[PDB]
């Protein structure tokens, strides 16, 4: 059994003291743990990415980014907590300004943390990029350049690598496989999956067939719009899970 | 999604600070923060609860109970906890001492949060029954008092409470229905299925359903060691779930 509630006491005490260590100049254990701890109290739950963003958690975001840009666990926290916003439908039209995608954007290049930081950048702009294109108004960078990176970005990563993350589910990835308005966040979300069944295949064959991604997995290699490299990794993907059965 | 929390060390990270904290006899929002992320990442996930026991959690949550008595929301996320501790079969014997089973037998009358600690530590009182008297050892209070503060506190909750616990499957609930051995801990378990299917029937009729509830709920309808009582919840349940 679990809770995933909203506390605003969490969230708050949270930011209190990120924004002191900020003011210290000083990213150390503390800060570290602050930026972890607001990653597990989103993670499945919406009513603390509600209140991460309404007590205005971007800003903090972004001056920890700009003074300290060398910590890789650091922002390995903050780009894993933004990848549990972005999953909140709801609360995408706040990350779609300028400022913060130019951030997203160039963070797809990021070596910090294996390929974590990357990764999670990825997934935001995947969530984002299935809204469709009217979503992303006059934001800059342009979308198209921005979904020309995410494929650098999908491809520069071994398959095969060592993963700092967890998932309890894998439904937010699960539903960027139906549809064609974005192929390339269903080749992200294809490649989450493929990625973590090769390294950790008794966690995640079980839940990836428990949670119906065979079937999801299988429309992709009949589907029109889905490319034939995501297609390729669909394939593998399904014939490990059926060995792991 | 979350860190790698074998990797990080998180549960560790987590002992540590609730070690500080109650050093510091402090429970504020950090102290339940960690307490609430334990319960959270043990959620069906038995090396963690491992971790726990074996870091000497258990010596962190007798002294937090003792030093903070009157902190609700740390009582429900430490009694949480142990709950899905007390699902690992292979865990529960470091669960059997005279010190623990009063803990947990007392706790059925705790008023925090509702319901949530009396039914979390309900919860974990029937994992153990389950395991039969042989289990229970010359371990005080008597098993068969125990049990009997069990059924009173089932009776004393309000069958239509609003929940601050909730559940990705049904399937350690479920595996205390099909069994003699503590008929408190089937009817435990099919108090926790009716309260659920009643108050939130949109996500828990479907997850019963699919996990094989209602043919255990038949077998509980036609057993022998089953109460009166008990049989007529699942009669229910089956009802709601059927209607759904």
Not at 218 to 228: G, S, V
């Given at each position: 059994?679990?809770?995933?509630?909203?506390?605003?006491?969490?969230?708050?005490?949270?930011?209190?003291?990120?924004?002191?260590?900020?003011?210290?100049?000083?990213?150390?254990?503390?800060?570290?743990?602050?930026?972890?701890?607001?990653?597990?109290?989103?993670?499945?739950?919406?009513?603390?990415?509600?209140?991460?963003?309404?007590?205005?958690?971007?800003?903090?975001?972004?001056?920890?980014?700009?003074?300290?840009?060398?910590?890789?666990?650091?922002?390995?926290?903050?780009?894993?907590?933004?990848?549990?916003?972005?999953?909140?439908?709801?609360?995408?039209?706040?990350?779609?300004?300028?400022?913060?995608?130019s951030?997203?954007?160039?963070?797809?290049?990021?070596?910090?943390?294996?390929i974590?930081?990357?990764?999670?950048?990825?997934?935001?702009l995947?969530?984002?990029?299935?809204?469709?294109?009217?979503?992303?108004?006059?934001?800059?960078?342009?979308?198209?350049?921005?979904?020309?990176?995410?494929?650098?970005?999908?491809?520069?990563?071994?398959?095969?690598?060592?993963?700092?993350?967890?998932?309890?589910?894998?439904?937010?990835?699960?539903?960027?496989?139906?549809?064609?308005?974005?192929?390339?966040?269903?080749?992200?979300?294809?490649?989450?999956?493929?990625?973590?069944?090769s390294?950790?295949?008794?966690?995640?064959?079980?839940?990836?067939?428990?949670?119906?991604?065979?079937?999801?997995?299988?429309?992709?290699?009949?589907?029109?719009?889905?490319?034939?490299?995501?297609?390729?990794?669909?394939?593998?993907?399904?014939?490990?899970?059926?060995?792991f059965?």
């Amino acid at each position: 059994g679990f809770l995933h509630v909203g506390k605003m006491g969490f969230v708050v005490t949270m930011l209190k003291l990120i924004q002191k260590k900020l003011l210290d100049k000083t990213c150390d254990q503390v800060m570290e743990f602050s930026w972890s701890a607001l990653w597990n109290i989103t993670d499945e739950t919406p009513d603390n990415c509600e209140m991460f963003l309404n007590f205005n958690g971007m800003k903090l975001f972004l001056d920890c980014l700009k003074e300290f840009p060398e910590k890789q666990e650091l922002h390995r926290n903050m780009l894993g907590l933004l990848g549990n916003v972005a999953e909140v439908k709801e609360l995408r039209p706040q990350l779609m300004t300028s400022q913060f995608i130019s951030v997203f954007s160039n963070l797809l290049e990021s070596k910090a943390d294996g390929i974590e930081v990357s990764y999670n950048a990825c997934g935001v702009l995947s969530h984002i990029m299935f809204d469709g294109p009217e979503a992303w108004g006059v934001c800059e960078p342009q979308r198209e350049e921005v979904e020309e990176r995410m494929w650098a970005a999908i491809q520069s990563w071994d398959i095969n690598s060592r993963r700092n993350i967890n998932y309890r589910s894998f439904e937010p990835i699960l539903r960027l496989l139906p549809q064609g308005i974005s192929p390339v966040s269903q080749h992200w979300a294809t490649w989450a999956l493929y990625n973590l069944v090769s390294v950790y295949p008794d966690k995640y064959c079980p839940l990836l067939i428990k949670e119906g991604g065979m079937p999801l997995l299988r429309d992709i290699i009949k589907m029109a719009t889905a490319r034939q490299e995501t297609k390729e990794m669909a394939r593998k993907v399904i014939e490990h899970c059926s060995n792991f059965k």
